[PDB]
């Protein structure tokens, strides 16, 4: 399908309820005469930014919210205009996930998180810890089964383990995700990835396992557990496997932390059907009946629409989804997310296949991601940002016992209490600084900034700020 005025083309991932969505499309056509074509191309999230400029995109694209900041920076999304009454129908935190630089850039549909799914006939009590899986697999192999199979090809599925003991994508500091502060190669990420690679080393899992392989093995009853989202429940229902959905195992006593996605619908900037797309999304899809149709095809998870979520919340499988979601973290939607995922994808694949050691693979991923992020800001921009901060300090200085404000060439010091150590967060406007650190001065009992013995120098300690250099 190609875009045409007076009809709608919608893209959604092949794991989602595209047939349920087409039923919503059918009702839209019945009512309005506007034909709706739903497609599920492979790699649609990469394809969209490639083909939009040629006029080969959809009118509406569905994906988890994490990709949308990138699309918005590239000018590929139309602005959406839900009035206040409409916005009030959805949970505020679902709107937050689709807010980029203060604008709503897509409609939220549903909250997704991975859970542990287990076969109750093979395993009545699911393991509480990752650590106990190796012995569980040993026991099951003897009966011609395996403990656990999940998609190892996509970092989304391995992340919850990587994050458990301390891995993170970007640090949130000073009211934003700090792209200088990337947590892909710290001790926590390395611990989690090592545990995974050890499972492979010890033949508890196979490095080649992908989504379809894992799904079939669980649904055929060949493996005791899988890790998957709410969309997978339908096929399990069909297979008649006796299954439960539960909290992911802990690692080193800590919860697994899945990255939480809000499935969202954005409108192509190049669509001549923006008003029809709005009508479809607000008045047909985002209704009790619209979401039920999609949900009955493949479960959406916790829907963004409050009225319908209030029903679905009583489902124990949704209760488990929300439990894992709260233990996890909502994904950033910043443009840097695709580069983050690429780096982790490569790191996991390389570690799992033995191409690299765990430490090499994550160091490389961290290095390559950071190389890209650290190239954004020019010297000229960085000078401009410091100059702005200087002009602010000079304002504060003009408006002036405690120590007094002064400019030290990088930061404006505040008042300091007599005889005290003064700590100032490492300034946000210095791109390369560590922003979870503080710079330090000492204030005299006499209300003068402490000097360096045998110098006219003022003492300051910026060692925490320079952590990354």
């Amino acid at each position: 399908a190609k875009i045409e005025e007076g009809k709608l083309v919608i893209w959604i991932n092949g794991d989602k309820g595209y047939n349920g969505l087409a039923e919503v499309g059918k009702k839209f056509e019945k009512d309005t005469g506007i034909k709706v074509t739903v497609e599920h191309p492979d790699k649609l999230e990469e394809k969209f930014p490639q083909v939009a400029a040629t006029g080969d995109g959809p009118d509406i694209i569905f994906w988890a919210h994490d990709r949308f900041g990138g699309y918005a920076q590239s000018g590929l999304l139309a602005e959406i205009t839900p009035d206040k009454a409409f916005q009030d129908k959805l949970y505020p935190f679902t709107w937050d996930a689709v807010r980029y630089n203060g604008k709503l850039i897509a409609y939220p549909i549903a909250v997704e998180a991975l859970s542990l799914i287990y076969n109750k006939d093979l395993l009545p009590n699911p393991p509480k810890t990752w650590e106990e899986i190796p012995a569980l697999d040993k026991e099951l192999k003897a009966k011609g089964k395996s403990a656990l199979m999940f998609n190892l090809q996509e970092p989304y599925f391995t992340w919850p383990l990587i994050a458990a003991d301390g891995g993170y994508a970007f640090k949130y500091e000073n009211g934003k995700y700090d792209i200088k502060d990337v947590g892909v190669d710290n001790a926590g990420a390395k611990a989690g990835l090592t545990f995974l690679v050890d499972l492979i080393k010890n033949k508890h899992m196979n490095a080649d396992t992908d989504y379809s392989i894992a799904e079939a093995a669980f649904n055929k009853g060949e493996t005791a557990m899988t890790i998957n989202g709410p969309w997978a429940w339908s096929n399990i229902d069909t297979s008649k496997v006796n299954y439960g959905v539960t909290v992911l195992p802990t690692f080193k006593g800590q919860p697994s932390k899945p990255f939480v996605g809000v499935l969202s619908a954005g409108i192509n900037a190049a669509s001549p059907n923006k008003e029809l797309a709005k009508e479809f999304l607000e008045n047909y899809l985002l209704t009790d009946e619209g979401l039920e149709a999609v949900n009955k095809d493949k479960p959406l998870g916790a829907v963004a629409l409050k009225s319908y979520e209030e029903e679905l919340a009583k489902d124990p499988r949704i209760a488990a989804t929300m439990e894992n979601a709260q233990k996890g973290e909502i994904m950033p939607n910043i443009p840097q997310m695709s580069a983050f995922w690429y780096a982790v994808r490569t790191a996991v694949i390389n570690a799992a296949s033995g191409r690299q050691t765990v430490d090499e693979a994550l160091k490389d991923a961290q290095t390559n991601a950071a190389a890209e992020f650290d190239d954004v800001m020019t010297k000229e921009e960085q000078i401009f940002l410091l100059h702005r901060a200087q002009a602010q300090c000079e304002k504060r200085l003009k408006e002036v016992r405690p120590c007094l404000p002064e400019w030290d060439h990088i930061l404006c010091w505040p008042l300091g209490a007599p005889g005290e150590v003064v700590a100032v967060p490492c300034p946000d406007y210095i791109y390369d600084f560590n922003h979870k650190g503080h710079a330090y001065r000492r204030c005299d009992r006499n209300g003068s900034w402490e000097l360096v013995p045998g110098h006219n120098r003022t003492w300051a300690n910026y060692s925490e700020c320079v952590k990354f250099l």
Partner: peptide, 20 residues
């Protein structure tokens, strides 16, 4: 490229701070 230029500038800025 940008990163090298920017960090180099900051090291010189960190040094003005030290001299202050």
């Amino acid at each position: 490229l940008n990163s090298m230029e920017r960090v180099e500038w900051l090291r010189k800025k960190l040094q003005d701070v030290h001299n202050f």
